[PDB]
Amino acid sequence: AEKPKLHYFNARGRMESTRWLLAAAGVEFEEKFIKSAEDLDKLRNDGYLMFQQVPMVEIDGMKLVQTRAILNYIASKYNLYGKDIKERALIDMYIEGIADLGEMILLLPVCPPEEKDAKLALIKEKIKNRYFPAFEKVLKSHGQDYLVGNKLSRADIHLVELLYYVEELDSSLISSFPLLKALKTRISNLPTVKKFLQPGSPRKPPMD
Amino acid sequence: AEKPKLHYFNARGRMESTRWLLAAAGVEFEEKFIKSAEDLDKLRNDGYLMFQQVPMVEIDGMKLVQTRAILNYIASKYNLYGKDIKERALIDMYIEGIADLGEMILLLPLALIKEKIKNRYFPAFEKVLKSHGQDYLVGNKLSRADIHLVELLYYVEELDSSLISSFPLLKALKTRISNLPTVKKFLQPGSPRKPPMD
Known part of the structure; x- marks a missing residue:
């Protein structure tokens, strides 16, 4: 080991x-x-x-x-990574959505300065209208503690990691998403x- | 069904x-x-x-x-996708390099693109075929890595037919999968x- x-x-x-x-x-x-x-x-x-x-x-x-x-x-x-290839497919769909958003946040400081203001504008729009709504819907649909299989997986970890970077960006963005707020707490503990x-x-x- | x-x-x-x-x-x-x-x-x-x-x-x-x-x-x-966890890791390493090179080409619609091919990606896959001399990339058995690499070989072609010229084992893998x-x-x-x- x-x-x-x-x-x-x-x-x-x-x-x-x-x-x-x-x-x-x-x-x-x-x-x-x-x-x-x-x-x-x-x-x-x-x-x-x-x-x-x-x-x-x-x-x-x-x-x-x-x-x-x-x-x-x-x-x-x-x-x-879940228990069977169907659990892995749900997990794979969720975390690649998260990596698509993470990559834009990641390259943001190397963008051309004349292009900086519009790229930032576009990233809170997606957070608000596309990605954050999609994950609140998942947790609401089953009401359980974890995103997949009622058990901890890599998906909970990569999601909570992203929630911190968003907070550093604009701490008002997560407000209207109470199920996301509580997942962040339970995982951080x-x-x-x-x-x-x-x-x-x-x-x-x-x-x- | x-x-x-x-x-x-x-x-x-x-x-x-x-x-x-x-x-x-x-x-x-x-x-x-x-x-x-x-x-x-x-x-x-x-x-x-x-x-x-x-x-x-x-x-x-x-x-x-x-x-x-x-x-x-x-x-x-x-x-x-391989027969176990370590076969899966060699496959993921190879196909994400391939998805990297393909991303650049897809968004193209170059000198840089041609340099990396000739000096980074093609020498790396020729090295893998030379290391074991078998007809497939991993485990001596057809895998997703063989299919994704050959698809790419067809696109690289459309660009510049001489890029593959110095890579004999890649030309031959292209021939056998196509058959x-x-x-x-x-x-x-x-x-x-x-x-x-x-």
């Missing part, structure tokens, strides 16, 4: 959703920071990156690249997650 | 990789084409799209959206396969 090793920069970027899932499942890990174009060159030049890029994760004797491959393997290994949210954890700060 | 129903435009777009995978697996399906903005308004008001967008596929009692959710279900049902009976039927005229944009 040796430790998985995360290779990335000292930032949120494309490694942060992997930090959140390993911690919620209670696994302990080490990180390898990248601080220069020289270290990035020795990984590459040493044959560690199949497509010459990070993120990279060493686990169970492998060297994986691509965020979605890293996340799907961990979720299976720790039983966080699980022992493994409450720790990861406490000061001193491997959680990383905004991309100042 | 009802067949899968695919809802999209009459074009390649974001439904074509799904067209390839079901045909390769021998599955007959139906298509309902979107041919006017009002067609798409009725799909929304009747409540068939969880996030108000297509593609959407009806299958085994459910309505699925998001291309990656749709493809993962189909690949597991017809045993084209599979389900796949050769799909490349023949009269199939659901779609033409390039014009």
Whole structure:
């Protein structure tokens, strides 16, 4: 059960959703920071990156690249991917909706400054009219504690992670969604997650 | 015993990789084409799209959206996703590199695009075939990675026919998959396969 090793920069970027899932499942890990174009060159030049890029994760004797491959393997290994291929399809539809919204928030600060005001405007519109309504409807339809199978899964974790970034954006956006508000609370109080949210954890700060 | 129903435009777009995978697996399906903005308004008001967008596929009692959710279900049902958890990780790594390179090409409607091909993606898949010398990418058995890579090989071609020239094992994988009976039927005229944009 040796430790998985995360290779990335000292930032949120494309490694942060992997930090959140390993911690919620209670696994302990080490990180390898990248601080220069020289270290990035020795990984590459040493044959560690199949497509010459990070993120990279060493686990169970492998060297994986691509965020979605890293996340799907961990979720299976720790039983966080539902019980059968029909549960996985519901889970897959929900989390890809969440990654579509996350990616726009993620690239927002690299947009052209002359294009910045309209892109932001467009992202709260979708949050309000498309994505937040869709997930409140899911929880209302069955009235249960979790999004799928009445049991904790990766979908609850990736959703709650996104709710925090939205709050940093505009804390009024979640108001009219009381079922979402309460999920955020119940998940943030699980022992493994409450720790990861406490000061001193491997959680990383905004991309100042 | 009802067949899968695919809802999209009459074009390649974001439904074509799904067209390839079901045909390769021998599955007959139906298509309902979107041919006017009002067609798409009725799909929304009747409540068939969880996030108000297509593609959407009806299958085994459910309505699925998001291309990656749709493809993962189909690949597991017809045993084209590996035999265990580690075979699945090599397959996900390969096909998301492929979905990366294909995304750039799809939105194209380049020098950069041509450099990455010749120096990043094609040398990486030639290395994989050379490492074990077998006729398929993973587990010595036909998988979704083989189908998605060959579809891409056909698009890269339309762009520039000399890009593949220095990659002998890729040319040969292209030849053998195309000769599979389900796949050769799909490349023949009269199939659901779609033409390039014009």
